[PDB]
Amino acid sequence: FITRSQAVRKLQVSLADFRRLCIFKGIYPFYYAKDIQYLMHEPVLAKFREHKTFARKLTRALGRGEVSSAKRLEEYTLDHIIKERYPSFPDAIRDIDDALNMLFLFSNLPSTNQVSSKIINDAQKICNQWLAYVAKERLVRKVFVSIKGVYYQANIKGEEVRWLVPFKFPENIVDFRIMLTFLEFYSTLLHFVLYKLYTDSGLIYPPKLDLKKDKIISGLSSYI
Amino acid sequence: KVPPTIAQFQYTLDRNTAAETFKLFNKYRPETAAEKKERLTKEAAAVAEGASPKPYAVKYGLNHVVALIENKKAKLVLIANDVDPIELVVFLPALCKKMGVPYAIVKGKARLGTLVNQKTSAVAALTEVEAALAKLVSTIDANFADKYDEVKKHW
Amino acid sequence: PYEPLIDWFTRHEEVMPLTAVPEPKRRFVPSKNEAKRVMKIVRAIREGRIIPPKKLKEMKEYDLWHLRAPKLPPPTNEESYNPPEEYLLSPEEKEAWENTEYSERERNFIPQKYSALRKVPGYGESIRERFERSLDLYLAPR
Amino acid sequence: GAYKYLEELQRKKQSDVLRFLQRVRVWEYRQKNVIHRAARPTRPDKARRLGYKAKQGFVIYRVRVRRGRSLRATAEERVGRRAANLRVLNSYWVNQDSTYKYFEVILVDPQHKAIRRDARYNWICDPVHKHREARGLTATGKKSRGINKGHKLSLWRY
Amino acid sequence: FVRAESIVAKTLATSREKERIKRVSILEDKKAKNETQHIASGKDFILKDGKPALLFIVRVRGPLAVNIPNKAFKILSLLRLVETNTGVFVKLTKNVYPLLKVIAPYVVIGKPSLSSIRSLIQKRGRIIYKAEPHEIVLNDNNIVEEQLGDHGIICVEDIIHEIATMGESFSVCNFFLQPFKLNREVSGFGSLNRLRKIKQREAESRTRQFSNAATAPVIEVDIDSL
RNA sequence: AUGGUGAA
RNA sequence: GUUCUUUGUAAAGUGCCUUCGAAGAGUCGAGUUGUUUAUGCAGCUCUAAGUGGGUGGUUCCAUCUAAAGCUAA
RNA sequence: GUUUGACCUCAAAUCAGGUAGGAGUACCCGCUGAACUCAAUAAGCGGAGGAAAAGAAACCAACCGGGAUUGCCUUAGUAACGCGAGUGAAGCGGCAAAAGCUCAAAUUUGAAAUCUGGUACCUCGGUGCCCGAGUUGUAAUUUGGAGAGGG
């Protein structure tokens, strides 16, 4: 076992990126050496180093000038982690019950400096697919109208996901950085989960969607 | 003690005129490797499926910059102060003065090169330009070449 | 030791250039050294090993199918917008719950009742509960 | 070219500018180690006319030798000893002091693929040229050997 | 201390803005009188009329740091859109039509959508009232049921309908809404933010352009951008 | 003399 | 010999007309001190020229272009 | 705008791609170098190859010119020296073999056109992409036999 600081020094990766790595993988007690050794072999470290080098080269270009170089410099998904933490699709569905609460909360958050508009747009669009799928297989079994929101319980192959729908009222705004990493991981999981569910439903994916109806209500009344 | 021929640098162009010179030079930045390569690829694609005015760019290479000098082709010469081999640039101001060509000194060779893509350029010059070049030359003259014409003195 | 220099030579300006080198045609010709590279690229495109720039843009385009249980939190406990009248606890208990030390606090909600649906208030503590659960979602010793 | 002027400037070493430059650089050289890498040659004209080029694979060294064997050859041998994998093609003077003399030496890497891949310098990669300074085959070595041009028992079967 | 260039640039920009405002006002005064005999144009058109139409307006930054001009500053104060990235819904009318040109350089206008209006109302909202400095968000409809609802606007959906359907309580609700402070685009600085801002700025020139012509058609852009 | 060997 | 390629306003040579048109510096050299088979080298103060300079013998003539480098026999 | 990045320099790597030690030593290349003028001999030191080294004249020549370097005969036991013991060559002449040449040196400026490294294909390497070296100079064009621009 090694200390958290010792493990960070061995990985020589700043705590900000170590938080993301631990969230993707999961390490806790002081910490067992084997977990740190396994993490060090992950390919995500190479991608993080590449991103840091890209950022520093972009800063070099911006300081030197010639913005064309910075624009030209602009030229990933944690698929492997999904398999490790979710050995099988039922395991992913089981973990959904607590994972997707963060995504559903983010689906109604307002855009701010701490959260880019793209993140909120993706979160809202993910709901447009989740509700669309749930409205075709008719797996809804509970509709508890709680103060926190309407506590939905869709019987997703017998795991009774306890996802909660936040109210449409403005959710006035903690360290969102960790929340941002959790949202990114859950969105990466949701992409594959939705792909699998749509393939199982027999509908061609991605199916067509209607935007004029979206401009009227913007919600489940679209995307067939 | 530095001889009178040395210390001609370090006393350089003022802040505002230096910034104006940098802005003017940025208007004629030479095409970079990526831009040149993409332009050549586009030209090849156009020709391979289905004659331009002479280009303009800043002069930076010491050998060809000096070659333009003496021939009176250099309209303006910009020199760095922090160059490690001083002998490379000690004679350049004297040659420019003898040939009757405007010249100026700047602090920071890397900043000199940042406007010409290369990491460092030591010296730079311009061959062609639109009309602000004359005003910049007059300002540089009145602020360095005529106000500090006594560079031959002091130690 | 300390004397000024003499500008005996740097006082007159030459008229004619020091050299009368003949003018090369290349200066008056569109960069034949660049037409060479243009034709090399043309040859490479003809051989097909170089993709035209348009195809690069036109080609900028799948189902992939210490590990203790996370211990999910308990389900809802009479936090409905229209709960039984008996479950609407007195203000004194609600005040104690609100003033209860955090973390050690047991209940995660305050009892309330609302008849009209439009009167249902929006939850303001949703973000805080999710943030609290986030810590356990990855810092839990398990 | 600038070299045309640099050569003439270096010719008048007694001039004030070069006298100041030498006394400025002597202290910096002294503060450095006995043998140290030089990022760029302080006399680019001399190195370029000596066949040195700025392309990859070329290395410039500097070394200090006590004053009072030929100093150039001793400096070349000393730099070659530390730089076992490099070849001391040539060396030239840059600065002199009352107690020490400074000679710049240009090194060419034979293992580097860039040096091996060009016909203008691939000859130096042959094993025959190994330790060229050791045998005094350089310009200073040949001069010391007295290889000038001009005046400057056997029994057969029958 | 401030360098000379800034003062000269501000003066030059202010002169042009004042000249444009004066020309537009003088032309509009003659157009209203209906003489329409020795002016560039008398009719009005929009390209991408003064008929009723609910439109959304966003206060954009720029142009260069022109000192607050009386006409445009007062017009903005009427809509209380002084702060950048602030927007409010206004009822288009013939009398209000010249205001677009009066404050065209500082704002961008367009036709919103029902979904966009609903999302904006349900995601943002202010009620600056009971010391009453609190910026309480539209958490519950109780405030709407008490302070509002005299005309039947009891819930947020009623406010949405009034705004989209131009109801009688449109003026009352709009003032009560304390128009929203929309978040800025980049909302950052540092290594990536600088490049992102530089890239975004290019679209501003091609989208937020002012022809400065007295008879320039009303500038309109789809509100779907944000 | 050259180059090594050892000892109180 | 056999072949698939031969290419792009691509490269070279030669005679005619015309205009331009470089050369290895603490280096040659010089004095001294040590070595050398009265050449050369080395330490050191000085250290320069480009219709210039190095080696020679007759009244100043013959040859060459040094202080960088590769090269089987 | 007290924040920042560049450039220059100084360090670190169980990082990637590379190399020197040692041995043999007849021959070869330099330093040092002892005694019966002995001897620029022997020993010692350092470095290499199958040969090493030298090599295409700031050479010899006083001719009706020869014309890279090295070996043999001859020059010659002569010139020259110490005239004394001993040392001691070289041009020319004949023989075996012959080969040329490359950069600094003058603007590629209408395009650093140059190259190392990493990656995906067919592999004593070639192609696309990315980075880096490069302007304090990487390719072609010129090395005194001159050479360059043009018609």
After which residue numbers is chain A interrupted with C–N beyond 2.5 angstroms?
A: 29, 75, 173
Measured from Cα to the C1' atom, the residue closest to H125 is: D117
In this structure, the strands spanning D100-108 and D58-66 are antiparallel
Q: Which of C130, C133, C136, C142 to mutate to test the interface with A (most CBs of A within 10 A)?
A: C130
Resolution in A for the shown PDB structure?
3.9
From E113, which residue of chain A is nearest by alpha-carbon distance?
Answer: A215
Residues E124, A110: C-beta atoms closer than 8 Å: yes
* 3-class DSSP assignment, residue D88: strand
For residue E162, the one-letter residue type is E
Q: Identify the domain containing residue B130 by its residue range.
A: 1-155
d(CA D126, CA D144): 24
In this structure, the strands spanning B103-106 and B76-80 are parallel
Q: Is the dihedral of CA A59, A61, A63, A65 positive or negative?
A: negative
Contacts of C73 in chain A (CB under 8 A): 98
In this structure, is the CB of residue D125 within 7 Å of any atom belonging to strand G? no
How many beta carbons lie within 10 A of that of residue A13, not counting itself? Answer: 21
| Long-range pairs of D45-51 with CB within 8 A, sequence gap ≥ 24 | D45/D2, D45/D3, D45/D6, D45/D7, D45/D10, D46/D10, D46/D92, D47/D92, D47/D104, D47/D106, D48/D3, D49/D3, D49/D7, D50/D89, D50/D90, D50/D92, D50/D106, D51/D89, D51/D90
Is C58 within 8 Å of A123 (Cβ atoms)? no
Q: Which of A93, A121, A95, A91 is nearest to A106 (CA)?
A: A121
Residues B63, D20: C-beta atoms closer than 8 Å: no
How many beta carbons lie within 10 A of that of residue D97, not counting itself? Answer: 15
Tokens of E59: 């206060």
Rounded to 10 degrees, what is the CA torsion of A22, A25, A29, A34?
-110
Residues 9-28 of B with CB under 8 A from A: 26
How many beta carbons lie within 10 A of that of residue A154, not counting itself? Answer: 21
Contacts across the C-E interface (CB distance below 8 Å): 15
Q: Which of D78, D142, D84, D135 is nearest to D105 (CA)?
A: D78
d(CA B28, CA B22): 10
Q: Which of D117, D115, D108 is nearest to D138 (CA)?
A: D108
| Alpha carbon of C10: minimum distance to chain B alpha carbons (Å) | 5
Fold of D1-158: Ribosomal protein L15e (3.40.1120)
Rounded to 10 degrees, what is the CA torsion of A30, A33, A34, A37?
130
Q: Which of A59, A60, A64 to mutate to test the interface with B (most CBs of B within 10 A)?
A: A64
Q: What is the DSSP letter of D103?
A: E
Contacts of C124 in chain E (CB under 8 A): 139
Measured from Cα to the C1' atom, the residue closest to G71 is: D123
Q: Which of A172, A170, A219 is nearest to E114 (CA)?
A: A219
Q: What is the domain-level CATH number for residue B123?
A: 3.30.1330.30
Q: Which of C123, C86, C81 is nearest to A143 (CA)?
A: C81
In this structure, the strands spanning B103-106 and B123-126 are unpaired
Is E107 within 8 Å of E81 (Cβ atoms)? yes
Greatest C-alpha distance within chain D: 73
Q: In this structure, what are the phi and psi dihedrals at residue B23, rounded to the nearest 5 degrees?
A: -60, -45
Residues A66, B34: C-beta atoms closer than 8 Å: no
d(CA A211, CA E217): 29
CA distances from D19 to B5, C52, D9 (A): 12, 60, 12
Q: Which of D46, D97, D101 is nearest to D71 (CA)?
A: D101
d(CA A18, CA A21): 5
- Using alpha carbons only, how large is chain A's radius of gyration in Å? 20
Tokens of A168: 């449409």
d(CA E96, CA E82): 18
* Contact residues for B108 (Cβ-Cβ < 8 A; gap 6+): B80, B81, B82
Is B102 within 8 Å of B141 (Cβ atoms)? yes
Q: How many residues does chain E have?
A: 226
Tokens of E89: 């819904």
Protein contacts on strand G: list nucleotides below 7 Å from a Cβ: 7-11, 19-21, 23-27, 39-45, 47-48, 55, 67-71
Chains E and D lie in contact, requiring 3 or more CB pairs less than 8 Å apart: no
